[PDB]
Structure formats: structure tokens, C-alpha cells
A paper describes a structure:
The BH domain can bind to and regulate several GTPases including Rab5, Rac1 and Cdc42. In addition, the p85α BH domain, either alone or together with the SH3 domain, can bind to and positively regulate PTEN activity.
To determine if the patient-derived p85α BH domain mutations impacted the overall folded structure of the BH domain, several of these BH domain mutants were crystalized and their structures were determined using X-ray crystallography. X-ray diffraction data collection and structure refinement statistics for bovine p85α (105–319) mutants (E137K, E217K, R262T, E297K) are provided in Supplementary Table S1. Three BH domain mutants, I177N, E217K and E297K, all showed significantly increased Rab5-GAP activity, whereas the E137K mutant had reduced activity. The location of cancer patient-derived p85α BH mutations with significant impacts on Rab5 binding (I177, E217) and/or regulation (E137, I177, E217, E297) are shown in the modeled p85α BH domain: Rab5 complex. These mutation sites are located in regions of the p85α BH domain, well away from the Rab5 binding pocket. Further, crystal structure determinations for several of these mutant BH domains indicated that no major structural alterations were present.
Author numbering:
A (entry chain A): 113 to 167, 172 to 298
B (entry chain B): 113 to 167, 172 to 276, 281 to 297
Write the structure that this text describes.
Amino acid sequence: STLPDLAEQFAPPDVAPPLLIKLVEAIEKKGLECSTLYRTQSSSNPAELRQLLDCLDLEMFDVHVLADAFKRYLLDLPNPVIPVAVSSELISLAPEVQSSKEYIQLLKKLIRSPSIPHQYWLTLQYLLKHFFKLSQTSSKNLLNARVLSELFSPLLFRFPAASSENTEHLIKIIEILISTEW
Amino acid sequence: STLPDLAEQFAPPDVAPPLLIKLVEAIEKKGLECSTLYRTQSSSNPAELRQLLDCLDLEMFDVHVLADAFKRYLLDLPNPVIPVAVSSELISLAPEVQSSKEYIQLLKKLIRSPSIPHQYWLTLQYLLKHFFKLSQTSSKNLLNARVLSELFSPLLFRFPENTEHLIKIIEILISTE
């Protein structure tokens, strides 16, 4: 709620918001192999999780609390990682655009727009790297790229779209972008 | 024009773009008393000035070249220091509103909007501080708040009448730092 805009939390040459780096690195250190990471709610409520996003070393916290604070962070951003301007255009695309490659091309073109601060695309890239690292230990944490897209796309886009052939394409491109990080 | 957006050049807790700080500090060191600062075209063209804004110590350069690079910087920003939405609103209120105090209150309210990165208002504050510093030696450089407003308002707002109210806001904001 008091969480600043992504464009105010950091700037190049930094690669991601410092708070998001702390969360991701703590979660990867403690939960990379956790078979229920991001699929179980912790006991803390939103108010408690937000208190965490202000005050210590995050490794001190329960990994399930960190995972919930990670979700809380994405939800409390004034504008989502993928701005509504971008999602609005992607959803509007006709069925003749059957190509995931085209959807990806358009997301990158739109999100790299000069009207959108570079921090948004940088934050998405950092998150995709995190999701990819998780999917490379799928044999233990059970997370593949598609499930990660289905779990986190509603947090990255923050769009109540009514579910359609368009929404399947957005989930699909996030899936593809996770799997194709390196 | 590869110049990044103001919001991409720095972020809190930094108070202004690092390149703009270097320009301002060099100009104030070398040209605080120059009777023609910011009113003389130097021999350099935009390409040469951009060469300078794209990368060592700026004090090595002719002060009139630094002044031109300062202007070039404001012109090459992808979005102006005062965003188009803000200027548009202030301009459309031009016939109906007259109070300078109201315009100033509104400029601050609009530019502090959550939809606008804080860097824009921070950069404007830094620029106003520079312009005020110049006006304290106006007897020597001839740059008073009014002259500074007429020179730089078109660069801050990015407008080639209605503007007269905008220029007045910058003048007052320079004078009251």
C-alpha cells in the first residue's frame, strides 16, 4: 500500500528493487527445493507481511512467510510488474495472431516503450530468472514453468480478464519466457 | 538521442540525475558571473553536445559549451521535466484561472501525482535551486527569475499566449526558493 512505484525503488545500473532482491535471494537459499513453495499459505496476514516489507536479514524468517511476503510485494506495487497499458493491448489481440512468438514480440515492444520506465521490464526479467532457477530443480520442488506461470501471472498482470483464448496466450508466453531464460 | 528517462537516470534517495549534477556544478563553478550564460549559442552542434552527454571532468570544457549541453539535456529527455499531462492541464485552465498562487499549488499537486515518478519533481526542485543560485548574482550575470523563466520554461514544459501563465509560475518558483 505504501510500497513505492517500481520506477522509484531503483534505477539502472541496479537490476531490480533491492527489497525484491533480498526476498528472492532469501527464498532461493531456504526454499529452492521445497515441494510446497508458493503453494501453501503461511499463518501471517497481509498486515503482518507488509510490516516485514519495511523493517533485519530476511533469512531469519520462515520460508513460507517469505514466500507470502513475495506475493504480497507483487500485489502491493502501485502498478503491476506488467503495466495495465501492456496487458490491455495484449488481451485485445485478435485470434488471427495465433503465434506465441508474436505475443512475446508485442509484450517486449510495449513494455520497453519509452512511456514505461525501464524498471518494469528489468523487474520482470529478474522475476523470470527466479522462476527459471526454480524450474531447474523441479525434480524436488515440483515446479515447472507452466505451473509457475499459472501461479504468478495473475500477480504479474493484475488483470480481471474473464479467461479466454487471450488469457491462455498470456499465461503461455510467461510460461515460455520462464523456460527460455538460459 | 539515447538519453534515458529521468526516472531511469536515478532513484531515491538520490536527489537528481548524476549527469545533471555534474553539469550544474561545473556551470556554477565557471559561469556564475558570466553576463551571457545561457544566452549565447556555442560553436558545437547537437551531435557534439550529445557526444558530451554520452560520456571526463566537465570543468575542462568551455563554459558556453556546458551551458549548451545543459539545454541539450533538457531537450533530449524522452519526457520533459514537467510532463505533458501537467502542462496540458495548466494550459487548459488558462482563461478561467488567473491566480498565480493557485497555479503554483496546482503544479505541485499535479507533478507529485502517484502516476508520475518522483524523479520528475525532484529534478525540477534541483533545477529551481540552480536557477535561484544564478539569480543571487543577477547584477553580474543579468539572469533574474524573470529572464531565467523565459529562457527555460519552454525547455521544462517543452512548448514552442497561453504559456504566459506557465512562465509566470516558473518565475515565482525561482524567486521563492
